[PDB]
Design a protein around this ligand. Structure first.
Ligand SMILES: Nc1ncnc2c1ncn2[C@@H]1O[C@H](COP(=O)(O)O)[C@@H](O)[C@H]1O
Ligand code: MOO
Ligand code: MOO
Ligand SMILES: [Cl-]
Ligand SMILES: [Cl-]
Ligand SMILES: [Mg+2]
Ligand SMILES: [Mg+2]
Ligand SMILES: [Mg+2]
Ligand SMILES: [Mg+2]
Ligand SMILES: [Mg+2]
Ligand SMILES: [Mg+2]
Ligand code: NA
Lengths: 358, 358
């Protein structure tokens, strides 16, 4: 039991598609900032917390499933929900938290510290701290600008270094001091642009699905990734103004290396796509989606790859990631995007471990 | 004892936000077409069928809650799911129907005829039949064109008379003969434009919420209906091409009387609004939304209208309806839109009772 000799906390990422519990052990440096962070337990359950009926029976079953078999308890718990809960009004979220608070008060194995819905800006902060912690880039001042994207089911986040600016909302800027360094970040979350919510605007777009895929309205798929990408870009830019907001900022604050977490890691590591070195380019991602999915005959392809419940969406998802990164953020189609291997189960929760001490 | 004296049928509207069972008694004319249709039972349960976990335990609980206390069980049942189920791929929908089929197989009274997801086109056909049945406009050749709109959670439908047009998809046209008359309709459904799905693209738009309403990203509402309306119009037109699809047909096939069903009845019946005769105009809805909700203080509104559960969305919905009807469909903003008093619970289910006899 590592928690007899080190500080441990539990952090639950309560996202739109499920909840992932992590238990972390760590030591602290002489500023009481965590160091030597190790994940000692990880469990994911489905569906998302926001998608269950908020009553005591259902919440008890859900929390028992998430927590009951953890090899360690008697530790502090942070339960932080993200865009799934942000899609609900505060009045509806309150019912979930009232029941969750009651569940924790009615037991003794867990010490609930906080249970709340965090803003997308906070989530973006945690995304950047978690990834940079993992890359070991937090220790000292960097030669390089490191940008992080988190591709979620309901929101997407982007975060990159930017000197503190009196022209940009305080909400979109975070200054931190960590390991004796001062770091100023631009943070942004686009609610509605996560893959599930985005996809609900394009399910009858033939260009977004393999040939003869049965669209819900009775028409047939006729896939073409550049065309599907153009459709998605209207949501990104005509509706959300992603390009107006992000591109002028990146033009002035070049990111040297991009890292992505979230769904893109699963897409890129699937049997349908082929990437080396856990990295992709948008050019290659679009081409692969276009040729390996959009221009294929659906029935034939479906029977060939029966083992992938995302298969049907791959023409759309490859098009959407390109529309987001290239047409939205302005990233060069040939720029390397590193993605964290899905086996790592890397999310923003290390950022919570780190941030409380800053 | 109506079903001892008349034919009876159960029709379930399994929509995105809940399922509504109706039991109708009816007689039939010389062609065996239903006449004298009377609702004898109505029960609504939440949440939507597509929102529950598709296992035997949860489906049993849901169908028992929907059906077990009905007064009459030995009748044909139609279970038709709409846009909530259309958001899911066929592979995922199959699990729901496999389990629901199993549940019906253990009932010795209910006679399951069909359980399936209907297309938005069929939903629109049933919309128009149900409303025109209630307006008593089906029995004879009409002087005036009656158009119908159904404002759902996940899709919206529009349907109106139009002679066969060999240049328009077969899927968007229906020809029926009912009560000795020949009717040709244009039908269209827009998946992703129902109020829940569309709202998920605008939750961080301050123009769309009352002053000081807490947005998910931590900024404050600063409502302005014309500004919110312009944002929603970008989703209507730049993304879904509503106007390009619909307006040319409506200019060539004008509608004299518009009837709406679905959510608009609930909005318009709020005490925040001043409407008479169960009708509204878009210009009145937008001006009233703008003045009494968008430009008012959230904390004040919330304490002032304790019975309006969805009050927080009223600025956005006033803007959204106008964006859809006026900027999308091209309806004049001073045109009367009749809505059905919500206490009638008029949905498209009477359409199924009529249609299956043709
Ligand atoms: N093969 C895949 N392709 C694309 N997205 C995926 C795939 N598998 C999972 N996802 C998405 O990845 C995110 C995290 O997945 P999970 O660990 O199942 O919560 C969700 O938004 C999923 O919808
Ligand atoms: O709650 Mo999310 O799935 O990270 O957008
Ligand atoms: O399933 Mo709907 O709520 O009528 O869009
Ligand atoms: Cl459809
Ligand atoms: Cl947010
Ligand atoms: Mg997430
Ligand atoms: Mg949803
Ligand atoms: Mg477009
Ligand atoms: Mg009988
Ligand atoms: Mg409906
Ligand atoms: Mg716009
Ligand atoms: Na949505």
């Amino acid at each position: 039991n590592p928690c007899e000799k080190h500080s441990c906390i539990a952090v639950i990422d309560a996202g739109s598609t499920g909840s992932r519990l992590h238990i972390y052990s760590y030591d602290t440096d002489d500023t009481n900032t965590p160091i030597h962070i190790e994940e000692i337990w990880n469990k994911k359950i489905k569906p998302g917390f926001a998608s269950i009926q908020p009553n005591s029976v259902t919440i008890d079953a859900y929390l028992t499933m998430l927590l009951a078999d953890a090899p360690i308890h008697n530790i502090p718990v942070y339960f932080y929900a993200t865009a799934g809960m942000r899609l609900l009004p505060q009045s509806q979220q309150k019912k979930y938290y009232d029941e969750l608070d009651y569940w924790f008060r009615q037991q003794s194995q867990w010490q609930l510290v906080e249970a709340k819905t965090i803003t997308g800006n906070d989530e973006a902060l945690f995304d950047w701290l978690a990834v940079n912690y993992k890359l070991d880039t937090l220790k000292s001042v960097q030669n390089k600008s490191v940008g992080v994207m988190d591709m979620g089911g309901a929101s997407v986040q982007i975060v990159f270094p930017m000197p503190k600016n009196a022209e940009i909302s305080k909400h979109n800027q975070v200054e931190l001091n960590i390991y004796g360094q001062n770091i100023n970040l631009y943070v942004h979350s686009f609610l509605g642009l996560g893959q599930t919510e985005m996809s609900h605007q394009f399910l009858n777009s033939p260009s977004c699905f393999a040939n003869d895929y049965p669209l819900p309205d009775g028409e047939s798929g006729q896939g073409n990734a550049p065309s599907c990408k153009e459709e998605v870009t209207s949501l990104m830019n005509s509706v959300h103004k992603v390009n107006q907001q992000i591109q002028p900022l990146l033009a002035l604050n070049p990111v040297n290396e991009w890292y992505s977490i979230g769904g893109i890691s699963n897409l890129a590591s699937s049997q349908l796509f082929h990437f080396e070195n856990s990295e992709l380019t948008n050019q290659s991602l679009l081409q692969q989606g276009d040729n390996q999915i959009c221009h294929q005959q659906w029935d034939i392809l479906n029977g060939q790859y029966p083992d992938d419940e995302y298969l049907y969406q791959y023409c759309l998802l490859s098009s959407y990631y390109y529309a987001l990164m290239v047409d939205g953020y302005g990233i060069n189609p040939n720029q390397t995007i590193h993605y964290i291997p899905p086996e790592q189960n890397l999310d923003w929760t290390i950022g919570v471990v780190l941030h409380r001490a800053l």
